[PDB]
């Protein structure tokens, strides 16, 4: 029932992203440098790993959402969240 | 009861931190290179994440402890930990 | 019973390696630009957190596997996973 959560950051500033897996939902904490907001992503888990890298000034993420036993992968190139090619068997 | 660990890295000797959340209390162990060692972290939580990043060659940390749904930043930049403004609404 | 992930990323590519803790097994997940593939790492655990550098283009893994309250840190130097000098008092 406590909420697990997960971190990642780039740049110097820096950005930082926060995901909360809560009660099965996961939801996105961001600072870009001055105060705290709410980010775009929000999906289904109950535990959540996350990293990411810069090409140049792009910042791409990838979140691990699990549900049970199942690994759902969620992936931001700056234009939304979607669905990424990850799959495990376990 | 078990254990729950978060780990980040720093440079290319490296430097390494792993967090440990153990029966409600987070510590810290650090590698600098030769011998791993106990650090000046010490924060109440059931649930640890961390990220990283350098300015220059200043290592910033930030770990994200939380106890039930209340999720609490720790800051290092240097000269001791201290409280961030990370804030979340679980 | 549910999995617990953490993952780890490296380059421009990038390189991407998940680890999933399922059922006191840690396996490990692989993406090097062109589908997802299981990789070497197997270790017991029913927790898992990862970090990783690069020197040059040599990539560093090192995981951290618990069991209990005991952590048993994984080193992956490009030839194989060995067993680090990681201790802890938990
Ligand atoms: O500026 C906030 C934001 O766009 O940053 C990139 C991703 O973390 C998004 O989910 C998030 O909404
Ligand atoms: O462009 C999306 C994608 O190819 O990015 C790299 C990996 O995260 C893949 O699983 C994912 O489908
Ligand atoms: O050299 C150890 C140390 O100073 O490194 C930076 C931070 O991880 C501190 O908590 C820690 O005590
Ligand atoms: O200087 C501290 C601080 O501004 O650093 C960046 C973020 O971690 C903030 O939450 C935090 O308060
Ligand atoms: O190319 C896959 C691989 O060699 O990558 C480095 C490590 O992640 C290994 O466990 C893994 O088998
Ligand atoms: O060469 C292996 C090693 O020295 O690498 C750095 C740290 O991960 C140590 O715990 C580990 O034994």
Same mark, same amino acid.
């Given at each position: 029932?406590?909420?697990?959560? %997960?971190?990642?950051?780039?740049?110097?500033?820096?950005?930082?992203?926060?995901?909360?897996?809560?009660?099965?939902?996961?939801?996105?904490?961001?600072?870009?440098?001055?105060?705290?907001?709410?980010? %775009?992503?929000?999906?289904?888990?109950?535990?959540?790993?996350?990293?990411?890298?810069?090409?140049?000034? %792009?910042?791409?993420?990838?979140?691990?959402?699990?549900?049970?036993?199942?690994?759902?992968?969620?992936?931001?190139?700056?234009?939304?969240?979607?669905?990424?090619?990850?799959?495990?068997?376990?």
């Amino acid at each position: 029932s406590s909420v697990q959560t %997960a971190a990642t950051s780039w740049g110097t500033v820096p950005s930082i992203r926060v995901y909360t897996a809560n009660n099965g939902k996961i939801t996105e904490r961001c600072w870009d440098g001055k105060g705290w907001y709410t980010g %775009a992503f929000n999906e289904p888990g109950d535990n959540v790993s996350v990293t990411s890298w810069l090409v140049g000034s %792009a910042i791409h993420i990838r979140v691990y959402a699990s549900t049970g036993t199942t690994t759902t992968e969620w992936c931001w190139d700056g234009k939304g969240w979607y669905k990424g090619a990850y799959t495990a068997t376990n």
